[PDB]
Design brief:
heterodimer; A: 217 residues; mainly beta; Immunoglobulin-like; 2 domains; 7-stranded mixed beta sheet; 4-stranded antiparallel beta sheet; 2 helices; 49% strand; B: 213 residues; 19 strands; binds gibberellin A4
Chain lengths: 217, 213
């Protein structure tokens, strides 16, 4: 098959700045008819791919002129001038000159903004859950920047990793922020066995870790 | 151009499934259509294409198992899948080969329909409330299978300040949380409720967030 590579895999640009994504083809994408069917899709968080540019440089009249495509043969580039928040997401290049039709892994586009502290909130198990014999303690690390962050749980002062599930969201396009949730699940039996429960987050914006906790007692 | 996929679901290995793609906004019969799936690793992989005159073609990884087809009268693209295998699970989209009189290239993509091939059995979710200038509340949707699940607040009203995280798998059950932030005065003054829908198990669950005692 025809392998489609992309570069870079990640990218964080400041608004009003220009972003440049490259796509490398294992074979010339020039069709015997002379056309070059290489295209660029953009899949915004939680959405499906949108055709941005096709046949190397044609703008799928949907998107603006700040989106431009170029290249030839096996090398192609996409540039986004005066970047906007709505631009964040995953950019994919694709080829239709050859069957099977293939896509590249994509390139993530992040927006560069001012560091922002997380708004962590801890939530004791819910009354309904405990009746089921289960106990989950949730913690939210909302709207922070950069994406880099660390979460640490401690039961009565001791770090716990078993029964700790984590999830991160994509960069938000309304504020260029990031959010994370963490859940420490354990049986009611063990839950009612401890007094202190804590969620500890280490982030760039603060020297000492942002700690939130509560006591079952 | 409107493409809406449907029929996604959970099938056991070796099982079969029939996906549909309803089309509107363009002369469906004068376009080749295709199916592309996005893997959990998020890779897009073409899976089938049908021609205007009915010619059909696919990649070897799928030959003898999938069959594209079209119902021009009903304006529907179809995808019949047999001998499904665990590595088949993915989000399936129908795409249109839009460059009318000039070679293959995908125009529009549909909303996508989710399909999980696994031995794990579908399980309803348990929806627990998460209550404590700005206040944050949440909901814990836990122990369900398979994906997906929709979470809305106040029947869709509260949009801003919402964080529905991606569900995580710890066994054969998923679990996800969704948070919502509102002005302190907003609650418990006004009610805040999370509505959770799990099509697989045919289950809807509303949970009004009340103060804890
Ligand atoms: C093997 C095929 C299938 C083709 C012709 C040829 C190459 C490109 C395809 C399309 C792609 C674009 C149009 O939908 C189409 C109607 C067209 O003009 O070209 C398609 C046609 C078909 O399905 O009958």
């Amino acid at each position: 098959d025809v392998v489609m590579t992309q570069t870079p895999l990640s990218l964080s640009v400041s608004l009003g700045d220009q972003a440049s994504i490259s796509c490398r083809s294992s074979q010339s994408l020039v069709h015997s008819n002379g056309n070059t069917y290489l295209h660029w899709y953009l899949q915004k968080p939680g959405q499906s791919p949108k055709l941005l540019i096709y046949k190397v440089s044609s703008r799928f009249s949907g998107f603006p002129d700040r989106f431009s495509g170029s290249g030839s043969g096996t090398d192609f580039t996409l540039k986004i001038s005066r970047v906007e928040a709505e631009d964040l997401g995953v950019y994919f290049c694709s080829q239709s000159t050859h069957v099977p039709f293939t896509f590249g892994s994509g390139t993530k586009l992040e927006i560069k903004r001012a560091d922002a502290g997380p708004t962590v909130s801890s939530f004791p198990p819910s009354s309904e859950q405990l009746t089921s014999g289960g106990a989950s303690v949730v913690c939210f690390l909302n709207n922070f920047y950069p994406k880099d962050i660390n979460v640490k749980w401690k039961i009565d002062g001791s770090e716990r990793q078993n029964g700790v599930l984590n999830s991160w969201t994509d960069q938000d396009s309304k504020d260029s922020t990031y959010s994370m949730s963490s859940t420490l699940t354990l049986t009611k039996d063990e839950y009612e066995r401890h007094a202190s429960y804590t969620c500890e987050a280490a982030h760039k914006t603060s020297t000492s870790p942002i700690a939130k906790s509560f006591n079952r007692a | 151009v409107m493409l809406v996929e449907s029929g996604g679901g959970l099938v056991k290995p070796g099982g079969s499934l029939k996906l549909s793609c309803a089309a509107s906004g363009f002369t469906f019969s004068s376009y080749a259509m295709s199916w592309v799936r996005q893997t959990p690793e998020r890779r897009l992989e073409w899976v089938a294409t049908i021609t205007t005159r009915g010619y059909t073609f696919y990649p070897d990884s799928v030959k003898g198992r999938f069959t594209v087809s079209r119902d021009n009268a009903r304006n529907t693209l179809n995808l019949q899948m047999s001998s499904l295998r665990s590595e088949d699970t993915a989000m399936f989209y129908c795409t249109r080969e839009g460059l009318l009189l000039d070679y293959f290239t995908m125009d529009y993509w549909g909303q996508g329909t989710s399909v999980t091939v696994s031995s794990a059995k579908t399980t309803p979710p348990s929806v627990y409330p998460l209550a404590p200038s700005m206040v944050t509340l949440g909901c814990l949707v836990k122990g369900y299978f398979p994906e997906p699940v929709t979470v809305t607040w106040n029947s869709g009203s509260l949009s801003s300040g919402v964080h529905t995280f991606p569900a995580v798998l710890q066994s054969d059950l998923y679990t996800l949380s969704s948070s919502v932030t509102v002005p302190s005065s907003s609650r418990p003054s006004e009610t805040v409720t999370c509505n959770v829908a799990h099509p697989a198990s045919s289950t809807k669950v509303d949970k009004k967030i009340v103060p804890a005692d």
